[PDB]
Amino acid sequence: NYEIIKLLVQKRVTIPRPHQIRCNCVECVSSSEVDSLRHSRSRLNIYKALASPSLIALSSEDPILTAFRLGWELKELSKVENEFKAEYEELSQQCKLFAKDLLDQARSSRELEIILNHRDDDLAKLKVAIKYHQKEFVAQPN
Amino acid sequence: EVIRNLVKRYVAAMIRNSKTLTEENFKELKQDISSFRYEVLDLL
Amino acid sequence: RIPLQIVRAETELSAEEKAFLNAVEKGDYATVKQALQEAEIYYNVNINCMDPLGRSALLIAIENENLEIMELLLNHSVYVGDALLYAIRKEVVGAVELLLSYTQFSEFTPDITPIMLAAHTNNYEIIKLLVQKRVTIPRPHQIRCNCVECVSSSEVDSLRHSRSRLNIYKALASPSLIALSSEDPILTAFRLGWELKELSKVENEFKAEYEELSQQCKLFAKDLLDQARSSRELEIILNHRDDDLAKLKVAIKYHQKEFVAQPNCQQLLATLWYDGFPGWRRKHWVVKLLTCMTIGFLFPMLSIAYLISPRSNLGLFIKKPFIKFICHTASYLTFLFMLLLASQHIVRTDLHVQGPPPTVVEWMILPWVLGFIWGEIKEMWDGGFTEYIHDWWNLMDFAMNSLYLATISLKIMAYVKYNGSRPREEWEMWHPTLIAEALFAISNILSSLRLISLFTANSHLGPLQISLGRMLLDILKFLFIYCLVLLAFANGLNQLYFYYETRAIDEPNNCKGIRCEKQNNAFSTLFETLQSLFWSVFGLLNLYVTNVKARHEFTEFVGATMFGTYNVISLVVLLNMLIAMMNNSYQLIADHADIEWKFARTKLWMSYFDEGGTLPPPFNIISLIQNQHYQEVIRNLVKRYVAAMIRNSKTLTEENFKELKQDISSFRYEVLDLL
Amino acid sequence: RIPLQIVRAETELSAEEKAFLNAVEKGDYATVKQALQEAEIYYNVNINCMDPLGRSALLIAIENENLEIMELLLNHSVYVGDALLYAIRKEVVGAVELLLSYTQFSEFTPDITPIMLAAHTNNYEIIKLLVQKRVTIPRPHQIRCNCVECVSSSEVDSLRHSRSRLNIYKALASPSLIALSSEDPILTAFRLGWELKELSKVENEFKAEYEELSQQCKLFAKDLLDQARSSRELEIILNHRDDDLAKLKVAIKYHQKEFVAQPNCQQLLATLWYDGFPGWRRKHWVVKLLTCMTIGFLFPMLSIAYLISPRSNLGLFIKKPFIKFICHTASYLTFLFMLLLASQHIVRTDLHVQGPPPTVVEWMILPWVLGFIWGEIKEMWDGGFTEYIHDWWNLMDFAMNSLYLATISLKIMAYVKYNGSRPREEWEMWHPTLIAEALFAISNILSSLRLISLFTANSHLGPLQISLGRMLLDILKFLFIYCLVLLAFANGLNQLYFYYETRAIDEPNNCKGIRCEKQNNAFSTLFETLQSLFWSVFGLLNLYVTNVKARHEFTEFVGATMFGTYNVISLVVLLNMLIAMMNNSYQLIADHADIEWKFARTKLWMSYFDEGGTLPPPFNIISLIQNQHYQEVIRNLVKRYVAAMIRNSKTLTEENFKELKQDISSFRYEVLDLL
Amino acid sequence: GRMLLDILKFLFIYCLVLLAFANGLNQLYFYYETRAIDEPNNCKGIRCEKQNNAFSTLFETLQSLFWSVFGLLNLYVTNVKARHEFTEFVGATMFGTYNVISLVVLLNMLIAMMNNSYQLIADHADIEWKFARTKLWMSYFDEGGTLPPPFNI
């Protein structure tokens, strides 16, 4: 919900950062061994919040790039976390659609080249989409 | 600048698409009718 | 931990402003007057406030559909630019009528005008409101247009020229803007629907949008015709000529399969097709079958009757469409039956004759052959050369007729250059008689294969035959992959095995190739390798052909593996791939299989309506008032369609629920203030 | 002209009565009070009036859901018989609470009771209201019950005995009546779900209803434990013992595939399976594969370590479930590789000896053979003879082990009955050595075919292998038609051709049958005819077998037509028919392919958890507090489940539109009368 | 090529079935191997005009069972010079059982799942192709590798 989310973002609000896919630090391994079904549930809840289109269109420096990285990272989680594969795959498709719907709103050719030729620091953004296997983003008729 | 314009159009387009029934929605109409019924009845 | 903050800041709304839009749905106006009158001096509240979701003060009143607040805001000078489009988009007739009686952010592209948006919503009442005033919509340019401004606009800024053209066609394809403000709604839907189909190929990026629009126009034409209530009305529509069944010919020309296959149109066609027999539908299948050969057996009697006395009652039967079809089929069946006797009426004595005279069967074939050749150019002349190639069955006629002409040319050529009789064993391998007999046999297959086109008339083999060829075009797409896989392995096999080619003298029974009793030299030449690999698909190539005379069975093993790998790819994999997609392609065809057959059968029937070509191939050689009548029928049809279509729409959503809430909320407030 | 008139007449409603029902939804009571007071003397209006649809006066009051006119009617003695069921059916809690505190036509079967109907609606709030009062539901009889009253009642009146049982099971299977008023809701769902499934076969007429009820219980148990919020809760539920993982074993016994295959249960099972390796999921596929043979190659070392020191740290590796699986697979894979070397390690000099001693390879096979036989009775003993026959793979073990025992029995028997060496060409057809070698080779195929059962462990080949055999049952079901079509044609062909049987001497190379270079006597006997028709499916039977020495080519033509018709039926029709149904049955299985695979893999995993059979076959031979804990967890799960599904119910219909109509009309009249 | 991966997964089951039956047939027929000299035209193996020694060795047994899928292996290869008509019948039944499993059962199984797998692939056919064509297009955009292969040097 865009209106409700914006209200809480105005106040000082933080979301815990999920750890890496291949992580073996002192607290990640310890927490998993003492209590499973909560370590996995907490990570799924966090990634559900991070993958919200309203939380990416708001409070994100580059909404297109963030959807690219988050959508691909969630896909890798569908293999390591084989038990929750169905839930993680539905989150991956959520981020892929958001990037495609965002650039579907271009109304002139000038806007399209600005997005596609943007470099993080020709067609630099298009190459990034190809690298992250963003098929829907690439294959849009525009 | 372009990104800001795209987000504004995307938010408005998807907001309108959302509002296009539910059994829980039927209760809200029931509540408003009952709330109005008692409020007028107490009024003279 | 990930801190979250507003990245792209936007100007916020003040406290006094927020209460204004919060109370807009309520129904109190004293706040508006107090602020607006003081706005001239105090400037306390900015009426043209901008909500974070991009909605302004005026747009809320439209969204809740209440017109009481709408009147008050329009009293004061507020910014109403691009606000008419929001009223039209919500299809609220009351809001629009008030509006005509009068960079920034907008939800609509700059090329949208109110008339185009009204046609997109397909609201008949609103569209009529704007068309009453002087309103125009631009002409779209042609598909292949290279003018000075089409190129300039497309080159300078695409994604807008393509969007503008699509938006224009969306407004033109709306049934409400075609049923209204169009002279001939049926003809307009035919032309527009055909044009959109052609535009779906040039603008391949927007295939889905243009194809959907084309189907919209096709449905409107059929739905308009579905409202006919009397046979008098139906005949007027179909017989109308803009310059019989003139309008039906146009529908066939524009590939309006749904329009033609309509049951009401088919009933009228069956009346003319079965002109002679009034009760053919109710007849038993036995009597229908038995009577079929009755006309067929007496086909020569009716044919000669037409020639000697066209006006005679006996000659009146032939031009009936069903009788003509039976007579033509019976005449053609005589040709095929008389071909079957051409392979048994020749004596053994004349087997060794070179350049023989025409036999007792070929002589009676000759009148038929000239009949087809004479009739082939006639249908070619009427439609031109361009129309010829489109029909797949029409290519078969040209190949078959050319082979017949080549056979006659060679037979007479060999009749004049050879006179004596020589034993057949020592004839040359390119002997003219041998070539003539080969070409004649090949054309016999093509002649017998034309009976498939007659399956369209039958109601059982019709739909299956039509769907049989519709999925054929998917097979040719797979033949390209196989023809390259076959070529890849044939080149490799020939290169390995060509060192061991042997002459036919050393072979057991002086025979070389794979057609001998003991196959040999299966991979000696590239021409032979392709034949060997083709026959291995059917298992007719033995495994011992991979051996060589000199026992180099490391080379033999490599050749066998290359042969074995081809079998796995072609048979296990590629053949099973073709089965997989043919089943998938069959599901799609079966949905529309009935519509295509009726369209195909209609073309078959209509060819026998005209007086031209009424004789079998063996016997082939020896104005203003009707415009207003159409107009009054169209006016009635449009009225019924508009009335019916309006309430199929009226037969729930989140936005509909809110409007009930607003009415309850508003009713509560005016009652409380009342004393 | 078909006149229409009332056939089954029903007494009409008077004018003064008709005003009552139309005004029931309005809300005027002065008419009721005047009429009911006057009903004592005037009897002007009969309050208990029945409308055309059989709706009694009180029934409409419940129908509009309002509790006001319901109250007033209840004050006067109106016929309230069977009215409570109507209130329950509408799922209205207000009407039921007021109604409880108090032949003809009824919409409900006479056996329906208020508690029975309440459970059918699955309304938690209404059910609890009735359960608080002393309420009982009759006990259903056993599936195989032959007591005095069950047979007597079913004989005198069916369609009611069956209806009563189905109605009872509908109430018992309601999740609200299981999650509430049950000691162990999970166990109750397990027993009831299995019992209902067994009832779908005896009551084959009502298979559709009983299967749906059984699926209802299975989903409830999975949903109930889906609400676990911590790992501590999950181990309490799964390890509960009604009398480790005791509850999970019960679920596997009752075939609760959905319960077992939930990702939360699988995570706990995977932890015990990979006890040795804590980070196996995150490992690369290269390191996962390379580490596999590390334990595999050194499998003898760990096995002997367990025997010599069960308490040693090195000897504890084999006790880990994953290591035990790898050790057994490596041991079994040794046998197959050790079988590869038995076909080449015998010398060409000893092929002419009769009854040889065991060779240099059969000696070390012997410990493996006894390892399987000794282990076969052990697993069979635990489950008994009845449990053994269910598993398809168990039959393969029995046949394979029996053949090895027969191979050893014949080899030793021939080892003592013969001493001299005689050339193999002169041996008898039934020589004991020849029979021993044939049985050894046959059992070799069965031993190698058992590696398919190991595909369940793999994640890629697992689901495909499971679905490989699920539709293998349909293939065997198709083999009955072929086995009789084959018999029909074999009898016909043998009848015609058995007069032309020839001796083997007259044949070219003293060979008789279809296995010779030149096939002959293909239809001489019934046994040979069946073989000939079988090999014709694969195209290995030549066409010239239909000829006979005496050239009666009318008999040959008939025999060839029998052969031709069999090919058309078996190959064109029957074979293509098997393909069509094979794909159709594949779509249904493909939806659930994951659930069955996880259930199949769970049984494989749980077999290695116990300490029995720790060593490979080569080395086979030389208490009240837990109830409170489970009850507390169950109470928490029910509360979360009940709240969750209640909100999911609140997530429109024509009947819902009526109360909004009633509320507006009721509010209209009270305000209008108000001043 | 999207459903070629599915085919490769079915090749594991067949390759295990092929090895199982190649084990039994070679275990039975390896006592009757004959030298090439005694053969009619000094030819040994299944690639001769008269096929012989089809199950003499394990390497040849695998080849014989492969060619039997396409019907290129004659039935008389199950005979032996010494007329032991019980070994031949058992060997012929091993050959017959392999044909039923591989052709009637396994091959129809492969057709069924590929037919099912085509429906899912056919939905996303357009999107996958456009992504594939985009990579091909962008390969020719760069100036590197401008010259054709023959003119590279």
Ligand SMILES: Cn1c(=O)n(CCCO)c(=O)c2c1nc(Oc1ccc(/N=N\c3ccccc3)c(Cl)c1)n2Cc1ccc(Cl)cc1
């Ligand atoms: C290509 N090929 C071949 O040409 N010959 C003829 C050589 C004669 O000189 C072979 O015998 C040969 C061969 N592939 C072989 O194994 C494979 C067999 C089937 C395979 N797939 N799908 C199938 C799908 C449906 C039905 C059947 C198969 C694949 Cl992928 C590989 N085998 C047998 C073989 C021989 C020796 C060894 Cl050591 C191992 C295997």
Ligand SMILES: Cn1c(=O)n(CCCO)c(=O)c2c1nc(Oc1ccc(/N=N\c3ccccc3)c(Cl)c1)n2Cc1ccc(Cl)cc1
């Ligand atoms: C059963 N049968 C047969 O045994 N022989 C061999 C006998 C000589 O040994 C024949 O030649 C014979 C025959 N059926 C014959 O025509 C039919 C052919 C196919 C048919 N169906 N489906 C098919 C489905 C898929 C693929 C192919 C066919 C049917 Cl229904 C009938 N023909 C040919 C024929 C011969 C003489 C004549 Cl005057 C007319 C036709």
Ligand SMILES: Cn1c(=O)n(CCCO)c(=O)c2c1nc(Oc1ccc(/N=N\c3ccccc3)c(Cl)c1)n2Cc1ccc(Cl)cc1
């Ligand atoms: C495996 N097999 C075999 O090898 N031979 C040749 C050995 C001699 O060389 C046989 O003749 C033999 C045999 N199965 C036999 O019957 C069956 C036939 C088909 C079967 N299934 N599905 C099919 C699916 C699709 C199409 C066809 C079949 C099954 Cl399950 C059994 N028959 C015939 C037979 C002979 C004698 C007797 Cl008393 C009874 C039957």
Ligand SMILES: [Zn+2]
């Ligand atoms: Zn960590």
Ligand SMILES: [Zn+2]
């Ligand atoms: Zn132009």
Ligand SMILES: [Zn+2]
């Ligand atoms: Zn009983």
